[PDB]
Design a protein around this motif. Sequence first.
Motif, PDB file in Angstrom:
ATOM      1  N   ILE A 154      25.903 -13.677 -88.709  1.00  0.00           N
ATOM      2  CA  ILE A 154      24.625 -12.984 -88.779  1.00  0.00           C
ATOM      3  C   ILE A 154      24.373 -12.112 -87.558  1.00  0.00           C
ATOM      4  O   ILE A 154      23.845 -11.006 -87.686  1.00  0.00           O
ATOM      5  CB  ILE A 154      23.474 -13.962 -88.921  1.00  0.00           C
ATOM      6  CG1 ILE A 154      23.364 -14.423 -90.365  1.00  0.00           C
ATOM      7  CG2 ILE A 154      22.158 -13.326 -88.503  1.00  0.00           C
ATOM      8  CD1 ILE A 154      22.241 -15.427 -90.576  1.00  0.00           C
TER       9      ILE A 154
ATOM     10  N   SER B 248      23.681  -8.134 -87.996  1.00  0.00           N
ATOM     11  CA  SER B 248      22.474  -7.520 -87.443  1.00  0.00           C
ATOM     12  C   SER B 248      22.865  -6.394 -86.477  1.00  0.00           C
ATOM     13  O   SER B 248      22.207  -5.343 -86.418  1.00  0.00           O
ATOM     14  CB  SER B 248      21.599  -8.568 -86.746  1.00  0.00           C
ATOM     15  OG  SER B 248      21.275  -8.174 -85.420  1.00  0.00           O
TER      16      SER B 248
ATOM     17  N   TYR C 219      25.797  -4.502 -86.601  1.00  0.00           N
ATOM     18  CA  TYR C 219      26.201  -3.430 -87.489  1.00  0.00           C
ATOM     19  C   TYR C 219      24.987  -2.697 -88.037  1.00  0.00           C
ATOM     20  O   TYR C 219      24.890  -1.471 -87.935  1.00  0.00           O
ATOM     21  CB  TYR C 219      27.038  -3.996 -88.629  1.00  0.00           C
ATOM     22  CG  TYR C 219      27.199  -3.074 -89.813  1.00  0.00           C
ATOM     23  CD1 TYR C 219      28.251  -2.164 -89.869  1.00  0.00           C
ATOM     24  CD2 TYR C 219      26.310  -3.123 -90.887  1.00  0.00           C
ATOM     25  CE1 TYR C 219      28.408  -1.318 -90.957  1.00  0.00           C
ATOM     26  CE2 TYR C 219      26.460  -2.281 -91.979  1.00  0.00           C
ATOM     27  CZ  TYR C 219      27.511  -1.382 -92.008  1.00  0.00           C
ATOM     28  OH  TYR C 219      27.668  -0.548 -93.091  1.00  0.00           O
ATOM     29  N   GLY C 220      24.057  -3.465 -88.593  1.00  0.00           N
ATOM     30  CA  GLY C 220      22.827  -2.935 -89.147  1.00  0.00           C
ATOM     31  C   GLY C 220      22.083  -2.013 -88.204  1.00  0.00           C
ATOM     32  O   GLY C 220      21.693  -0.911 -88.596  1.00  0.00           O
ATOM     33  N   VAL C 221      21.900  -2.446 -86.958  1.00  0.00           N
ATOM     34  CA  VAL C 221      21.198  -1.620 -85.975  1.00  0.00           C
ATOM     35  C   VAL C 221      21.938  -0.309 -85.724  1.00  0.00           C
ATOM     36  O   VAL C 221      21.318   0.766 -85.690  1.00  0.00           O
ATOM     37  CB  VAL C 221      20.987  -2.371 -84.642  1.00  0.00           C
ATOM     38  CG1 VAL C 221      20.686  -1.408 -83.520  1.00  0.00           C
ATOM     39  CG2 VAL C 221      19.842  -3.355 -84.776  1.00  0.00           C
TER      40      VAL C 221
ATOM     41  N   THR D 270      23.744   1.217 -87.799  1.00  0.00           N
ATOM     42  CA  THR D 270      23.500   1.988 -89.009  1.00  0.00           C
ATOM     43  C   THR D 270      22.116   2.658 -88.988  1.00  0.00           C
ATOM     44  O   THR D 270      21.996   3.829 -89.353  1.00  0.00           O
ATOM     45  CB  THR D 270      23.655   1.100 -90.275  1.00  0.00           C
ATOM     46  OG1 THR D 270      24.910   1.389 -90.906  1.00  0.00           O
ATOM     47  CG2 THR D 270      22.515   1.325 -91.275  1.00  0.00           C
ATOM     48  N   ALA D 271      21.080   1.941 -88.548  1.00  0.00           N
ATOM     49  CA  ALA D 271      19.731   2.520 -88.495  1.00  0.00           C
ATOM     50  C   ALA D 271      19.693   3.690 -87.528  1.00  0.00           C
ATOM     51  O   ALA D 271      19.108   4.740 -87.821  1.00  0.00           O
ATOM     52  CB  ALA D 271      18.697   1.472 -88.097  1.00  0.00           C
ATOM     53  N   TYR D 272      20.325   3.504 -86.373  1.00  0.00           N
ATOM     54  CA  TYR D 272      20.456   4.597 -85.417  1.00  0.00           C
ATOM     55  C   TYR D 272      21.072   5.814 -86.105  1.00  0.00           C
ATOM     56  O   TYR D 272      20.499   6.901 -86.095  1.00  0.00           O
ATOM     57  CB  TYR D 272      21.300   4.174 -84.215  1.00  0.00           C
ATOM     58  CG  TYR D 272      21.725   5.344 -83.372  1.00  0.00           C
ATOM     59  CD1 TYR D 272      20.865   5.893 -82.425  1.00  0.00           C
ATOM     60  CD2 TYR D 272      22.981   5.923 -83.535  1.00  0.00           C
ATOM     61  CE1 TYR D 272      21.244   6.984 -81.654  1.00  0.00           C
ATOM     62  CE2 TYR D 272      23.368   7.011 -82.772  1.00  0.00           C
ATOM     63  CZ  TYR D 272      22.496   7.539 -81.833  1.00  0.00           C
ATOM     64  OH  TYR D 272      22.888   8.619 -81.075  1.00  0.00           O
TER      65      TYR D 272
ATOM     66  N   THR E 223      21.159   6.612 -89.125  1.00  0.00           N
ATOM     67  CA  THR E 223      20.202   7.170 -90.084  1.00  0.00           C
ATOM     68  C   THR E 223      19.172   8.089 -89.421  1.00  0.00           C
ATOM     69  O   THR E 223      18.918   9.198 -89.888  1.00  0.00           O
ATOM     70  CB  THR E 223      19.438   6.053 -90.835  1.00  0.00           C
ATOM     71  OG1 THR E 223      20.272   5.484 -91.850  1.00  0.00           O
ATOM     72  CG2 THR E 223      18.189   6.608 -91.478  1.00  0.00           C
ATOM     73  N   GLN E 224      18.575   7.630 -88.330  1.00  0.00           N
ATOM     74  CA  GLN E 224      17.552   8.432 -87.662  1.00  0.00           C
ATOM     75  C   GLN E 224      18.092   9.641 -86.905  1.00  0.00           C
ATOM     76  O   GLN E 224      17.383  10.624 -86.735  1.00  0.00           O
ATOM     77  CB  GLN E 224      16.765   7.571 -86.685  1.00  0.00           C
ATOM     78  CG  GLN E 224      15.826   6.606 -87.339  1.00  0.00           C
ATOM     79  CD  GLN E 224      15.247   5.648 -86.334  1.00  0.00           C
ATOM     80  OE1 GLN E 224      14.905   4.511 -86.664  1.00  0.00           O
ATOM     81  NE2 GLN E 224      15.137   6.097 -85.086  1.00  0.00           N
ATOM     82  N   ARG E 225      19.332   9.557 -86.439  1.00  0.00           N
ATOM     83  CA  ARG E 225      19.900  10.560 -85.531  1.00  0.00           C
ATOM     84  C   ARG E 225      19.781  12.021 -85.995  1.00  0.00           C
ATOM     85  O   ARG E 225      19.198  12.831 -85.269  1.00  0.00           O
ATOM     86  CB  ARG E 225      21.368  10.237 -85.260  1.00  0.00           C
ATOM     87  CG  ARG E 225      22.045  11.128 -84.240  1.00  0.00           C
ATOM     88  CD  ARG E 225      23.403  10.552 -83.904  1.00  0.00           C
ATOM     89  NE  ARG E 225      24.432  11.581 -83.803  1.00  0.00           N
ATOM     90  CZ  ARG E 225      25.732  11.350 -83.964  1.00  0.00           C
ATOM     91  NH1 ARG E 225      26.159  10.124 -84.244  1.00  0.00           N
ATOM     92  NH2 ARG E 225      26.607  12.346 -83.852  1.00  0.00           N
ATOM     93  N   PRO E 226      20.298  12.362 -87.196  1.00  0.00           N
ATOM     94  CA  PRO E 226      20.384  13.792 -87.525  1.00  0.00           C
ATOM     95  C   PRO E 226      19.022  14.475 -87.530  1.00  0.00           C
ATOM     96  O   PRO E 226      18.908  15.635 -87.139  1.00  0.00           O
ATOM     97  CB  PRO E 226      20.997  13.788 -88.922  1.00  0.00           C
ATOM     98  CG  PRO E 226      20.547  12.518 -89.510  1.00  0.00           C
ATOM     99  CD  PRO E 226      20.601  11.526 -88.372  1.00  0.00           C
ATOM    100  N   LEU E 227      18.013  13.757 -87.997  1.00  0.00           N
ATOM    101  CA  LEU E 227      16.661  14.277 -88.073  1.00  0.00           C
ATOM    102  C   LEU E 227      15.852  14.217 -86.761  1.00  0.00           C
ATOM    103  O   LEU E 227      15.200  15.193 -86.359  1.00  0.00           O
ATOM    104  CB  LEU E 227      15.932  13.533 -89.174  1.00  0.00           C
ATOM    105  CG  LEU E 227      15.235  14.529 -90.077  1.00  0.00           C
ATOM    106  CD1 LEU E 227      14.953  13.929 -91.435  1.00  0.00           C
ATOM    107  CD2 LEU E 227      13.963  14.874 -89.372  1.00  0.00           C
ATOM    108  N   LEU E 228      15.895  13.077 -86.091  1.00  0.00           N
ATOM    109  CA  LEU E 228      15.139  12.905 -84.862  1.00  0.00           C
ATOM    110  C   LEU E 228      15.678  13.743 -83.715  1.00  0.00           C
ATOM    111  O   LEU E 228      14.908  14.205 -82.875  1.00  0.00           O
ATOM    112  CB  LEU E 228      15.113  11.433 -84.455  1.00  0.00           C
ATOM    113  CG  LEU E 228      13.767  10.758 -84.720  1.00  0.00           C
ATOM    114  CD1 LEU E 228      12.945  11.609 -85.679  1.00  0.00           C
ATOM    115  CD2 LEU E 228      13.938   9.359 -85.276  1.00  0.00           C
TER     116      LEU E 228
END
Lengths: 47, 97, 46, 48, 194, 564, 255, 62, 124, 103
Positions: D29, D33, D35-37, D39-41, D43-48
């Motif tokens: 776990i 968690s 890996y997940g984090v 992945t979230a980074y 996700t936000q990167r190209p736009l932020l």
Amino acid sequence: GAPPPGMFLRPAHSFRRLAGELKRRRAQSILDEVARAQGMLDLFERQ
Amino acid sequence: ERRALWAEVGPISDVGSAVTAWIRFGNDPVLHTAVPTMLGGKFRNQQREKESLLPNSSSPFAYVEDYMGTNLVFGSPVHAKESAAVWATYFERRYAS
Amino acid sequence: DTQNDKKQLARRLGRYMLFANRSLDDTGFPTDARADDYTRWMAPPS
Amino acid sequence: ATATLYYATKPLSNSLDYASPYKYRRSLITLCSNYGVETAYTTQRPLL
Amino acid sequence: YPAAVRYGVELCTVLTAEGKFVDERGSGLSARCVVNGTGAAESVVFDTANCNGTNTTSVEDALRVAHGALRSAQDRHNTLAAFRLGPLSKQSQVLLFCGVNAYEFGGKYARTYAYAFEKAKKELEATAASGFMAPSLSHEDTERLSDQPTTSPSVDRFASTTHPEQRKAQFVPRVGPGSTPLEDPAADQKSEWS
Amino acid sequence: MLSQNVAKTTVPSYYMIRTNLPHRKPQNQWEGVYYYSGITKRQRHLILLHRKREREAHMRSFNISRASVLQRLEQLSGDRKQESLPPHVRLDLAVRLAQHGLYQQATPIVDELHHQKALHAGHYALLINALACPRLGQRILHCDAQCDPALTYKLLGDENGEERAQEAYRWFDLALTSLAVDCGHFVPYLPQGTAAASHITNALMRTLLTCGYTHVAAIPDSVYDRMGSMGISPTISTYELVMLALSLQGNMVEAESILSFLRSHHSEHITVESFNALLLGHREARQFDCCDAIWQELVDRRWPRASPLTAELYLRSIMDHANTPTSEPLQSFANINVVEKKKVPLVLAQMDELGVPRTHLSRVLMDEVEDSLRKFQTYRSRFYEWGRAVKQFDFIEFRRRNGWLYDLHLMKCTTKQVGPLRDFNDPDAVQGAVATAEIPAFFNERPAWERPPLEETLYVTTNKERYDDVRGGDIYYDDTRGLHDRSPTWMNEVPETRYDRLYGVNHPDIAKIGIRRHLNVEYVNRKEVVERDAALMKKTLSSGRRLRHRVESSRTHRNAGSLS
Amino acid sequence: SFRYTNNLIGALKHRLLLESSYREIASRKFIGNCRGVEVVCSGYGTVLAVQLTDKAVWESFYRKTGSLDLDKLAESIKTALWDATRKIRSAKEAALHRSLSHNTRMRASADLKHWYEEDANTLRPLAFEALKHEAATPWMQLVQHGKKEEAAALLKEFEQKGNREQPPLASTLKAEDSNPATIPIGSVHPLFTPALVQIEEAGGGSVSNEAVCRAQLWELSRDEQLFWERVELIRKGQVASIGSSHKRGYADEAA
Amino acid sequence: NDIYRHSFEDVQACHTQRVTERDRTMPPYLPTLPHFVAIIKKDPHISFLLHIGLPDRNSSEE
Amino acid sequence: HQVYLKDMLHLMRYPEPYTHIIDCRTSTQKMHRWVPHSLWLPRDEVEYALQLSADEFLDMYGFRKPDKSDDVILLSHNGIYSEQAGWEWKKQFFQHVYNYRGGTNELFGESYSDMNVSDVLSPW
Amino acid sequence: RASRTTAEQQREEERAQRFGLGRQGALVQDGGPDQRTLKKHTNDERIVDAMLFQQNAYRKTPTDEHWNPYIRRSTENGVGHLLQNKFDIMRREDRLSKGEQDL
């Protein structure tokens, strides 16, 4: 505070939450002042 | 799949292309930088008259974060830890279940 | 009289369409509907 | 991120605890968690 | 969002700005102007008060003065509009730019939009070629079957190709006025007239 | 397969021999002969394709000639340069530009000509007439307006109509100035009195027709009034332009009035174009009987000579008439107004008596007319052969492959009988049928409030015949089942589901057996939220009052108690 | 079926034509005249010149030895300007009208409201936006109208080398940019410009297949995985509640 | 709504139905006072009366 | 009403927001791929599923219930179960319901069948 | 906030009572989930939706059946599909303001 039923608390030091809390501080100062001002009107209106 | 592959950079890569983009959105360099900003009704426009934690800038683009209140890019170090913690907890619960 | 003056310019505009007899609905535009229908919708209270 | 999760979750390896099923679950776990984090980074990167 | 944008536009259209100009060449001729969001002038006025009794100002100079006044006025109006509509438009920018994935042009549907875009272009071309009378929606107009798109209403989707009783839309066979067949129209029942 | 393919004969038996029951239906006197009027999918497609290609041909022509004028402009601007071209070259250029609808480019040229006083009487009329774009008009007429002359005016109005109008007015004033110069007894009315002035005014009107509604409406009102005021006497084409304006507006009373006045005082001068105006007009107001009256009149007086445009307008008005629906009361049997198309082969015959060549009719109109023909026209040749049984039955076969047998006589078997109406004047009197007629069911059908709601959609009904021997009673019955009907045993007849343990439970918590609560990390249940808020609006009525404390009233002051 | 793509193609045909129109009107002159007075506006409604034609004729109308009216003169200026502006507005509306009358998909939905929902007030060029578009540098105008090629070009040449009658935009906007074929997707629907800009290529005006496919492929990946998650759970719920992994057939699977 | 937020997957769900220009978005003409003031000032006669037709608002008392 | 292979590929590359592609394949044992932008309502559940409220449906299938205006395309191995499901969706009155026959077999080149039914009738 | 939510929920329940929306009895009845009963002149979910189905079943656009001339010029729904060029629209405006008939 304690959230509304279906909701979750955004993190502190998040822009949206900082803005929200700010808004609340200001709004509540206003409501306080107003309450007291109307009290004073009552006082010299001799309620 | 073959056509796409990976993207290193977002739509707006540099400060240069950002300037171009910003002009194209219908913004005017003189006029649209000169309108004061509002912080909760206060008109924050009085500069360094007040102390709060919030980036000082005119553009709303400076205050953008996720819906979850999270910014893992260009966030202050506190914001950054707080937000990586948020997502960490979320994914921990997800992959647990 | 003199070319392109006030009066000439006015007479070019034609007949003035009365705002009373205009049939405008909710969006402030003239209606799709048949005149008999629109008239009934807007008829005075009783 | 994916390759990190891949190598780490490979059969018996230093990043997993084989001591007890509880400790095992926790190690796994923790890696997910992680890996997940990432992945979230991403996700936000190209736009932020 | 688009309602609010419209609101801004109509408000500025109806509101009014005012501007002044005084002559640089030394006669005290000055003009005031009042101006709509149309660019039009609701009022224009010269002021002989400032200037001396000698006058002797050619029509040219009065025209230059009124020019200058109309200018300063239209500019005042443009600037005011920037300030009235500015904040809402900036935040609109964040909404659309970072909130793409709410919209139909964001994400998986972006590709569809682009597609629709190109078709429109191509379609405009043929309308310009056909004399600005558009081709058939039904693509009945076309030389080859390869040409009619998968998106056209021409494409036949009916339970059956051959069997007429299986060619309805609803559970029984509806009829048009005069008990004329609705479901699959015969060639001469479709009339394109004026 | 096809459910209208239905036994017309009884099972073979001696009952066909021993009984006077007839073996076929008697012929139906009022059912027309079946004949062939109609086209294929393929044919309709061919027409549409072909039509499109002609449209393209025209648009191509317009592009070539426009491109040519624009090249002449660029060449005369740049290559001629410092040396000034003679006035006639510029004037021709201006005219040719305006005719293709580039008024913008013609404006400066015209200005510069008027400033040099290079224009004289007719030249102005030439320019103002060119502002009506009639090379653009050609293109619009053929492609967009689909060859209809009225539509062409209306659509031309959308090409920068307001600016062309404003230009026309401006040039008209320029012209009146130039005229007054050229005339310099009749000194006072010399400019207005001159024929040139009348010519120019006409030009102005003829152009304003081509701009939007507003301006068209302004011709018979202001322009004509201003022409009277000014003192300029009109010509027949003045009146025909005013009529054409009134008629585009659909104002028939006034158009017809003008023609009446003309008829009465000026009769020998009336051209065909006033009849054209009136025809176009009545067609717009959708009065087709008048559209007819005026054509018949124009055939009686055979002069002025009808033009292919006239014949076109009248014919169009007939097609328009033929395609309008009536209200629902008259729509139960068929669309009546088709009969109008049957006028057409009479009109065509008249066009030959009148010398109107039938091949000047738009491709469009001639398609509609050719259709109209193939519905009602046939020759004495075909007529001798059109009732052959082979052709009647072939028509039936065609209807069978398209699955429409409902109306055909031979091929339909009526079944349902409509019973008599009882009287409270007697149960005793036994009624019996004197006569029998087959009439559509919509005459008497149970009133919509008595019968169940939408039957076609919620019930599947089939009329069928009992197989068993029916001693007495009807040999047909209606098998009606509901659309949603299912075996009472259905739950056993179907594989098991994850729903089954909810059996016989009025309000299940589907939130609990559902997958969303495991899938989602957060999982807000929408039904606990609303519970919580109703629980909160219960607490607002749970208010008790705290005990207040009265003080003692006095007349002279207020008493102040303090906490003690 | 395909209601959305088709309605969309209709709507974008409409947009392209309004846009092409905006670019025609924006670079162009409009002349109002009243009595001897010529007011000249750009498409943006901005007064360019105020002139007197034929001083010979008109000068004594205003007097001049006479003293100027300035009242007559004011009214005629006002009127001229109004005339010009009204020409502009009419041009805009005209464009709209030609579009509606030729666009059959928009005609399919039967809406009288199509004819009134965009009028002179609403369409572009907008008068109160004149300044930011006109006062702009040639470079700025280039980028504003979405020509990234010529703007980049002009920028490199900028670095390496370091009453008039004409609308200020007739420089940047030439004839060929009235062709609806040329209009970049970023620029087509101005309302949404910041969102539609990301569909576009980094340098070129034309849409980038790569970016759009990237965007789609991302979502497809996510949504695939979601799909299997849900399938997994629904199946596990089936097996749990039924008790076994088997099911009956239907009464018709005997045959 | 700034301090508190909805469940993540609720907005995940919410972004499944996109906002569409044609149907799913409120129409650009809502009732708003300037929309109507614009509509009744857009009439040729009243536009003429406002600007030109009436004697100038600043010049004279009438 | 049918939807052909062409429509299917087109909708793979160019999805519409309010068109839903609904997978009807019944047994999880036989389904190894995912038709792009699809959702899973197995045929066996349909009669129940379509009688849930919007919320309940959301809870049981994990995706939004299509409104009755929206396009609904149905999917199965052969196009048989998708048909039967279609009848279900049509009986609750859904206005656009398209079956894609030959569906998952044509898409992925699998040969599977929803039901085992054979063309041959047993001699009477 | 509670007031808004409660009023929302109450409107939904009311609408449910007006048109008879919602499932009848138990969802998992033996004879199928489908089972429903219609009483004379009584609104029900099924009737509402069958009614809409009849209106627009496979309908792509309101103009779908306008290949048919007699359907096309029906004035029942309004006049809006019969106004095509600006000219005609303005004419309609004018004639209506004068108090005459629409052509």
